[PDB]
Amino acid sequence: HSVFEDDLPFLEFTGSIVYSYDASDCSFLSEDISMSLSDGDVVGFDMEWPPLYNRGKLGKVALIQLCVSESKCYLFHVSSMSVFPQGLKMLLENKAVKKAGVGIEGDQWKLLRDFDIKLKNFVELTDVANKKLKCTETWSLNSLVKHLLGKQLLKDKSIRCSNWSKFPLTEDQKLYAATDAYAGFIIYRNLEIL
């Protein structure tokens, strides 16, 4: 196999991972996020859900990740919250904050479906790359991490495709879920060249 085929080092977030599994708590964290951002700021977005199917569809969303800086990532374990955090809902529906990721359009659908939350102001990284990188490629979060950071995403399937609704999350789940948002945040920020 070629050099381009080589196994690159793993992308692993090493900053602050804030784990929240209580509604009230979550709403206040969301306000913290909002106090630390300004209109037009982009955060890394992503979500996880259990593997078992529910009445014909994928398991209901259980976790939401938001990387707001190169050193802080939020893990909102909504599946463990009695009611969906009102502060998070306003954050995800606030077009003042932009959400970046790969396959977000799909996340929007599932989000509206599982929680009736309307995700506002999101960018499909695939398009941001093709635009700023002056190309016309088919991307995945992983292929973007590789091409731009010289790294690949953690891939233990037993982790990534694990029961995200199971409380509490394990350090590995937290790391995985957290790094995806981070990659979303870093990849967007790095594509701002001209």
Task: Write out the residues near Mn ion by the rule CB under 5 A.
Answer: 46, 180
As measured in angstroms, the least distance from the Cβ of 148 to Mn ion is: 18
Q: Report residue 54: phi and psi, to 5°.
A: -115, 120
Is 39 among the annotated ligand-binding positions? no
| Residue closer to Mn ion (CB basis): 5 or 171 | 171
Q: Is 105 known to sit in a ligand binding site?
A: no
Compute the least distance from the CB of residue 1 to Mn ion, in Å.
27
Q: Count the alpha carbons within 13 Å of 73 in the hemisphere toward its beta carbon.
A: 29
Residue number of the CB closest to Mn ion reads: 180
78 and 22 Cβ atoms separated by less than 8 Å: no
- H or E segment to which residue 92 belongs: helix 86-92
41 is known to lie in a ligand binding site: no
Choose between 52 and 83: whose C-beta lies nearer to Mn ion. Answer: 52
How many angstroms separate the CA atoms of 44 and 178, rounded? Answer: 10
CB of 125 to Mn ion, least distance (A): 11
List, in sequence order, every residue forming a beta bridge with 89; answer none if it has no partner.
none
Per the annotation, binding residues for Mn(2+) are: 46, 48, 180
